[model samples]
Target: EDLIDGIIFAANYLGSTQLLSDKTPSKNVRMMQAQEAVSRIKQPMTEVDLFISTQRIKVLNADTQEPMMDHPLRTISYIADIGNIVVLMARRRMPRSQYKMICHVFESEDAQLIAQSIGQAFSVAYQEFLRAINPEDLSQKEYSDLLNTQ
Candidate 1:
């Protein structure tokens, strides 16, 4: 586990920023924009402990060790290392809309490792999925393609 400065925002809120111009922004620009976006919100920083498992990513109160939140591996859609932050995009079904996206930002020394762990965890879940649907004629190429679909 690591100490993380955390914040959450409505996933679509960032889309309103005109930063994504007609052309794709350079890596530097994108990273800068991400930093600016989070900073502009001025959300209070709360240091928390993060735990990643095969089925879920859990966040706990740093001082009390109480459960704060948890996200299943299947719900996470995007994970990225932006500057010094690990950005995670996830969604859940809502009564009003098909789904509501939730964006999480974590600032920590092990942010990069956190992102990698999430991806690897999903791969393990995918393997279990494939095993359950075992097909005798599946080729190595098809297996790789299925895994890479993530």
Candidate 2:
């Protein structure tokens, strides 16, 4: 709660007039509005961060799900780009369980276009994610894609 309030205050100080407008009915109304303002402000950042942080690039142990962190495949890059696309599509309400189905359709019907489309999609999603998160706070590391490549 404190964190949210602080964010709201920061936003208010940053000139988010929506957070400081006199449109509310009362002091309690304003506080509730502030909370809502902060929630709206934080939701995208939280979702995008969660998407990035929880991304899985290299395959993990089937049972343990721990990163085979030193596996040769772990050194490949671009998986984060693909994963970001998946996350963005999922956020836009694509059913993840159907991802394989979609991929199959793309692969079977038009492999070339699928490859181009996925690359474009990834670029769009990754750019949006970068714009949403504080660039200074992002980890200075890249993830490699093994499964998608091989």
Candidate 3:
């Protein structure tokens, strides 16, 4: 990918993300909806902050024949109850749309890994662009200066 596209991917890779077009719905896409209400609201951080206030989703495991009642957990907002939660959403479609909706939940460390990948992708693509230039015809001073930095 080009440098600009590389940056875009890293920036938007979390929310409103796109999985491989050929990838099936089951493996990747599918998530709980926006907590209709929340005291603990959060926004994209890598864009501005050094670290993001990330949240982890907890699951329920029951061995009894009777189903457990739902928990009254507030959705992740500016300030949510600091504990496990049951996610619910408002959607017109039920079964099918659930799989289509994707949530961008990941830690700050996870994004560093993505940033690493993005840098590598850009470097590789750029070297190809550089290869097409003739060393003899280019300005020797600029070429010498560029190579010196690395």
Candidate 4:
């Protein structure tokens, strides 16, 4: 029911980014990837209002209020704050038995706050997850494993 709302520019949509590593990449690497994506887009950015909530994240056109992008929060795998821009990596289902990790590049005057808001939402979710587990006899290692499962 909680929401983190703001206005951000939708800079680029990276449909298929070549992932360089299994783990999260560095900020510089992500920035390079975002730059490459922008070149590939060959278009200017669009102004959009971002609505990030516990359940889902949506992007709407600032002018017309039309839906530009909508995806469940669970689908988001990676989020990085790269200086003036924020990058989001989301796993999406494709046609037939297939899936892909798509990257969304967003520019905001308050990039730090945008990234922090998403992180806050995730932290709150983890708190609820811990509450649901309500472990009594679970070992420290076991509890760590449970959280790492995320």
lDDT per residue for candidate 4 within 25-134, as digits (tens), equals 55456556656754564335677777788877788887887987787877676666766677776666565545455678777777777778776675566566655566
Ranking, lDDT, top scorer first: 4, 1, 3, 2
TM-scores, all candidates, are 0.59, 0.21, 0.22, 0.63
lDDT computed for candidate 4: 0.64
**Which of the predicted structures, 1 or 2, would earn the higher TM-score when compared with the native?**
1
Q: Please name the candidate that would achieve the greatest lDDT relative to the true structure.
A: 4
Q: Give the residue spans of candidate 1 off by over 4 A.
A: 1-43, 132-150
Clashing pairs in 4: none
Largest TM-score belongs to which candidate? Answer: 4
The stretch of ten residues in a row with the least summed lDDT in candidate 3 is 48-57
Q: Regarding TM-score, does 2 or 4 come out ahead?
A: 4
Candidate 3's TM-score reads 0.22
lDDT for each residue of candidate 2 in 1-150, tens digit (9 for 90 to 100): 442111000001111212222221343543354444333432221111110111222223334545322212122222111211221111111244321110000001232333343344354444455553544454544321211232
In the range 23-116, model 1's lDDT, one tens digit per residue, is 3344455446545556655345666777777777777767677766688878665566655577765554455524454556777666666777
Candidate 1, residue 64: how far the Cα is off, in Å: 2.0
The lDDT of each candidate is 0.58, 0.25, 0.29, 0.64
